[PDB]
Motif scaffolding. Structure first.
Motif, PDB file in Angstrom:
ATOM      1  N   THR A  66     -69.864  -9.087 -11.595  1.00 23.22           N
ATOM      2  CA  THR A  66     -68.768 -10.031 -11.417  1.00 23.22           C
ATOM      3  C   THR A  66     -67.812  -9.565 -10.327  1.00 23.22           C
ATOM      4  O   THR A  66     -67.056  -8.613 -10.516  1.00 23.22           O
ATOM      5  CB  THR A  66     -67.981 -10.228 -12.726  1.00 23.22           C
ATOM      6  OG1 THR A  66     -67.430  -8.979 -13.159  1.00 23.22           O
ATOM      7  CG2 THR A  66     -68.875 -10.800 -13.816  1.00 23.22           C
ATOM      8  N   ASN A  67     -67.849 -10.244  -9.184  1.00 22.84           N
ATOM      9  CA  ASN A  67     -66.983  -9.898  -8.062  1.00 22.84           C
ATOM     10  C   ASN A  67     -65.937 -10.983  -7.828  1.00 22.84           C
ATOM     11  O   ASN A  67     -64.735 -10.714  -7.844  1.00 22.84           O
ATOM     12  CB  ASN A  67     -67.815  -9.694  -6.794  1.00 22.84           C
ATOM     13  CG  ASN A  67     -68.936 -10.708  -6.668  1.00 22.84           C
ATOM     14  OD1 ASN A  67     -69.790 -10.818  -7.547  1.00 22.84           O
ATOM     15  ND2 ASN A  67     -68.936 -11.456  -5.570  1.00 22.84           N
ATOM     16  N   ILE A  68     -66.402 -12.209  -7.612  1.00 14.98           N
ATOM     17  CA  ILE A  68     -65.505 -13.334  -7.377  1.00 14.98           C
ATOM     18  C   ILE A  68     -65.510 -14.297  -8.560  1.00 14.98           C
ATOM     19  O   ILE A  68     -66.288 -14.138  -9.500  1.00 14.98           O
ATOM     20  CB  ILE A  68     -65.892 -14.105  -6.100  1.00 14.98           C
ATOM     21  CG1 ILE A  68     -67.298 -14.693  -6.239  1.00 14.98           C
ATOM     22  CG2 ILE A  68     -65.811 -13.192  -4.886  1.00 14.98           C
ATOM     23  CD1 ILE A  68     -67.631 -15.718  -5.178  1.00 14.98           C
ATOM     24  N   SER A  69     -64.637 -15.298  -8.504  1.00 13.31           N
ATOM     25  CA  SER A  69     -64.540 -16.287  -9.572  1.00 13.31           C
ATOM     26  C   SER A  69     -65.908 -16.884  -9.886  1.00 13.31           C
ATOM     27  O   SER A  69     -66.320 -16.939 -11.045  1.00 13.31           O
ATOM     28  CB  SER A  69     -63.564 -17.398  -9.178  1.00 13.31           C
ATOM     29  OG  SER A  69     -62.235 -16.911  -9.116  1.00 13.31           O
ATOM     30  N   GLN A  70     -66.606 -17.328  -8.847  1.00 18.96           N
ATOM     31  CA  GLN A  70     -67.927 -17.922  -9.012  1.00 18.96           C
ATOM     32  C   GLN A  70     -68.747 -17.794  -7.732  1.00 18.96           C
ATOM     33  O   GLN A  70     -68.236 -18.007  -6.633  1.00 18.96           O
ATOM     34  CB  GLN A  70     -67.804 -19.394  -9.407  1.00 18.96           C
ATOM     35  CG  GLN A  70     -67.599 -19.609 -10.898  1.00 18.96           C
ATOM     36  CD  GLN A  70     -67.901 -21.031 -11.330  1.00 18.96           C
ATOM     37  OE1 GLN A  70     -69.021 -21.345 -11.734  1.00 18.96           O
ATOM     38  NE2 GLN A  70     -66.901 -21.900 -11.246  1.00 18.96           N
ATOM     39  N   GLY A  71     -70.020 -17.444  -7.882  1.00 18.24           N
ATOM     40  CA  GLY A  71     -70.889 -17.294  -6.728  1.00 18.24           C
ATOM     41  C   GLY A  71     -72.160 -16.537  -7.056  1.00 18.24           C
ATOM     42  O   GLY A  71     -72.373 -16.131  -8.198  1.00 18.24           O
ATOM     43  N   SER A  72     -73.011 -16.350  -6.052  1.00 17.22           N
ATOM     44  CA  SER A  72     -74.272 -15.643  -6.239  1.00 17.22           C
ATOM     45  C   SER A  72     -74.394 -14.480  -5.259  1.00 17.22           C
ATOM     46  O   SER A  72     -75.471 -14.212  -4.728  1.00 17.22           O
ATOM     47  CB  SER A  72     -75.451 -16.601  -6.060  1.00 17.22           C
ATOM     48  OG  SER A  72     -76.617 -16.100  -6.689  1.00 17.22           O
ATOM     49  N   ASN A  73     -73.281 -13.792  -5.024  1.00 16.83           N
ATOM     50  CA  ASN A  73     -73.262 -12.658  -4.107  1.00 16.83           C
ATOM     51  C   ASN A  73     -72.682 -11.420  -4.786  1.00 16.83           C
ATOM     52  O   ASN A  73     -71.567 -10.988  -4.496  1.00 16.83           O
ATOM     53  CB  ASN A  73     -72.446 -12.999  -2.860  1.00 16.83           C
ATOM     54  CG  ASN A  73     -73.122 -14.043  -1.993  1.00 16.83           C
ATOM     55  OD1 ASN A  73     -72.918 -15.244  -2.175  1.00 16.83           O
ATOM     56  ND2 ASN A  73     -73.935 -13.590  -1.045  1.00 16.83           N
ATOM     57  N   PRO A  74     -73.457 -10.835  -5.711  1.00 20.65           N
ATOM     58  CA  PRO A  74     -73.043  -9.638  -6.449  1.00 20.65           C
ATOM     59  C   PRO A  74     -72.995  -8.398  -5.562  1.00 20.65           C
ATOM     60  O   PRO A  74     -73.388  -8.441  -4.396  1.00 20.65           O
ATOM     61  CB  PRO A  74     -74.126  -9.489  -7.520  1.00 20.65           C
ATOM     62  CG  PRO A  74     -75.324 -10.162  -6.945  1.00 20.65           C
ATOM     63  CD  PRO A  74     -74.799 -11.296  -6.108  1.00 20.65           C
ATOM     64  N   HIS A  75     -72.512  -7.294  -6.122  1.00 21.47           N
ATOM     65  CA  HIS A  75     -72.414  -6.041  -5.382  1.00 21.47           C
ATOM     66  C   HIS A  75     -73.652  -5.178  -5.610  1.00 21.47           C
ATOM     67  O   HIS A  75     -74.455  -5.451  -6.501  1.00 21.47           O
ATOM     68  CB  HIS A  75     -71.160  -5.273  -5.801  1.00 21.47           C
ATOM     69  CG  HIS A  75     -71.343  -4.458  -7.045  1.00 21.47           C
ATOM     70  ND1 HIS A  75     -71.887  -4.968  -8.205  1.00 21.47           N
ATOM     71  CD2 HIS A  75     -71.053  -3.163  -7.304  1.00 21.47           C
ATOM     72  CE1 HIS A  75     -71.921  -4.020  -9.125  1.00 21.47           C
ATOM     73  NE2 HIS A  75     -71.422  -2.915  -8.604  1.00 21.47           N
ATOM     74  N   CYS A  76     -73.799  -4.138  -4.797  1.00 23.89           N
ATOM     75  CA  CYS A  76     -74.940  -3.236  -4.908  1.00 23.89           C
ATOM     76  C   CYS A  76     -74.531  -1.921  -5.562  1.00 23.89           C
ATOM     77  O   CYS A  76     -75.225  -1.413  -6.445  1.00 23.89           O
ATOM     78  CB  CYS A  76     -75.541  -2.968  -3.527  1.00 23.89           C
ATOM     79  SG  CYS A  76     -76.791  -1.663  -3.506  1.00 23.89           S
TER      80      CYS A  76
END
Length: 129
Positions: A66-76
């Motif tokens: 969970t990085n941003i409110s909503q999206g499909s670009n997680p962290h590594c």
């Protein structure tokens, strides 16, 4: 079994975000066998922040997705320090060698390299004994 890999000198644009200030930030991240430094721009202005291999205690698990409110670009990966936790890495959605988009430093592929470098440098150097 060789003494030649990414770590002695690595530079590129990387994006990260702090726990308090989720506000993502993009800067020319630079790492070496000495210490990690951040460059707001390529021009050449006063450094931003210095992250000595020492500070970097270890890397956290990818569990937290969970990085941003909503999206499909997680962290590594995440850089945990005595100061605060830093989230670095961005997954666009593609697992393949892309010297075109990976150039800037965006993607999981490119990230995997950095994480391995920053971490590989931790052991590379001699520890207190």
């Amino acid at each position: 079994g060789s003494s030649g890999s990414s770590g002695m000198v690595k530079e590129g644009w990387m994006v990260h975000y702090t726990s308090r200030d989720n506000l993502r930030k993009r800067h020319y991240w630079r790492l070496d066998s000495k210490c990690l430094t951040l460059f707001q721009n390529e021009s050449g202005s006063k450094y931003y922040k210095e992250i000595p291999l020492s500070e970097i205690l270890r890397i956290s698990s990818p569990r937290d997705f969970t990085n941003i409110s909503q999206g499909s670009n997680p962290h590594c990966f995440e850089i945990i320090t005595d100061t605060m936790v830093y989230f670095v890495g961005e997954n666009n959605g593609d697992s393949s060698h892309n010297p075109v988009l990976a150039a800037t430093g965006v993607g999981l592929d490119v990230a995997q390299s950095w994480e391995k470098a920053i971490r590989q440098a931790l052991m590379s150097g001699p520890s207190s004994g």
